[PDB]
Design a protein around this ligand. Structure first.
Ligand SMILES: */C=C\C(=O)Nc1cc(Nc2ncc(Cl)c(Nc3ccccc3S(=O)(=O)C(C)C)n2)c(OC)cc1N1CCN(CC)CC1
Ligand SMILES: [Cl-]
Ligand SMILES: [Cl-]
Ligand SMILES: [Cl-]
Ligand SMILES: [Cl-]
Length: 317
């Protein structure tokens, strides 16, 4: 295979300050924060994923795998890794996605989310996945909770901790998002991801409902073998639902390519009303502020005159 000449950047902990906890897990905490590169004179809104514990070697090995992958990708719909910090525990410094989970987002704003937005998120997510396929990368954990929202206009994929190379046979499980071939055979492929992509498209079409809700995960393998699938969402045209259903074929080669899913949804986003029926589609506004005022309250700090988003902070430094 090709040599991987990604640069891994090492940051001083002095260069950045934590501001708020975004998420607390066992063995990890995620901070909203600010980062000032050294001698740069720019301020960069970051999220900082840190391990509370000392190893936890398996946990420690999993965070460095995640940094390895994230450092090795460059795409507008994949999340950037800015660098790592070699403190008592290892920290990942990544671009901050100010609007959070796409999952959280759809539930919080379901009454103000129009068809153009849904169709385009579908297009972008596919594009990210297609980029990962291009790089021979299998995500193995696509879901709406792992898609982050930079602006309402711009989502990016994330959570590469489980990400493996194709055919790697590398050393909880979501289950509901998992292809049948993955549940029975621990087989994972880009077309395995295509399945998870379908379940994600479903999660968005229902504004965040739980797949196979009230069904125990142990049951699911039998359900999918019988021929049962997720129901057709209300807002959902047969055309869109028919796309989901093809992602959920038994024969993974018959499932659509991410290459194709970009094209299909892209066409639908040209006439978004014809493929998704949303009550009051017109008087729907989703607000993205780009003002220097906007960043505060968050990281209220004081003066954000020198903010640069990660996407505008490029290197060779
Ligand atoms: C639905 C959970 C979520 O994503 N909440 C969230 C996310 C962000 N933005 C953001 N930007 C960059 C990163 Cl790396 C993360 N990571 C992150 C944040 C929170 C939980 C988990 C992760 S992670 O996927 O494990 C990463 C690989 C470490 N997040 C955000 O920016 C403001 C705010 C939120 N939330 C958290 C939940 N909160 C209500 C309790 C609403 C806003
Ligand atoms: Cl500082
Ligand atoms: Cl966490
Ligand atoms: Cl500096
Ligand atoms: Cl970058």
């Amino acid at each position: 295979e090709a040599p991987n000449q990604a640069l891994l950047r090492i940051l001083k902990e002095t260069e950045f300050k934590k501001i708020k906890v975004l998420g607390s897990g066992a063995f990890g905490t995620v901070y909203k924060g600010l980062w000032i590169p050294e001698g740069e004179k720019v301020k960069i809104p970051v999220a900082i994923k840190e391990l509370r514990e000392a190893t936890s070697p398996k946990a420690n090995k999993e965070i460095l795998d995640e940094a390895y992958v994230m450092a090795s990708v460059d795409n507008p719909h994949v999340c950037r890794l800015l660098g790592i910090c070699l403190t008592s525990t290892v920290q990942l410094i990544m671009q901050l996605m100010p609007f959070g989970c796409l999952l959280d987002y759809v539930r919080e704003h379901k009454d103000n989310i129009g068809s153009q937005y849904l169709l385009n998120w579908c297009v972008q997510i596919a594009k990210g996945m297609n980029y990962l396929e291009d790089r021979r990368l299998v995500h193995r954990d696509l879901a709406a909770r792992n898609v982050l929202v930079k602006t309402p206009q711009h989502v990016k994929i994330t959570d590469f901790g489980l990400a493996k190379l194709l055919g790697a046979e590398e050393k909880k499980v979501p289950i509901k998002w998992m292809a049948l071939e993955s549940i029975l055979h621990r087989i994972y492929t880009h077309q395995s991801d295509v399945w998870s992509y379908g379940v994600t498209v479903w999660e968005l079409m229902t504004f965040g409902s739980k797949p196979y809700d009230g069904i125990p995960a142990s049951e699911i393998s039998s359900i999918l073998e019988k021929g049962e699938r997720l129901p057709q969402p209300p807002i959902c045209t047969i055309d869109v639902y028919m796309i989901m259903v093809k992602c959920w074929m038994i024969d993974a080669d018959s499932r659509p390519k991410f290459r194709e899913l970009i094209i299909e949804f892209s066409k639908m986003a040209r006439d978004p009303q014809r493929y998704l029926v949303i009550q009051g589609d017109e008087r729907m506004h989703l607000p993205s502020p780009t003002d220097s005022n906007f960043y505060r309250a968050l990281m209220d700090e004081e003066d954000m005159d020198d903010v640069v988003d990660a996407d505008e902070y490029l290197i060779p430094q």
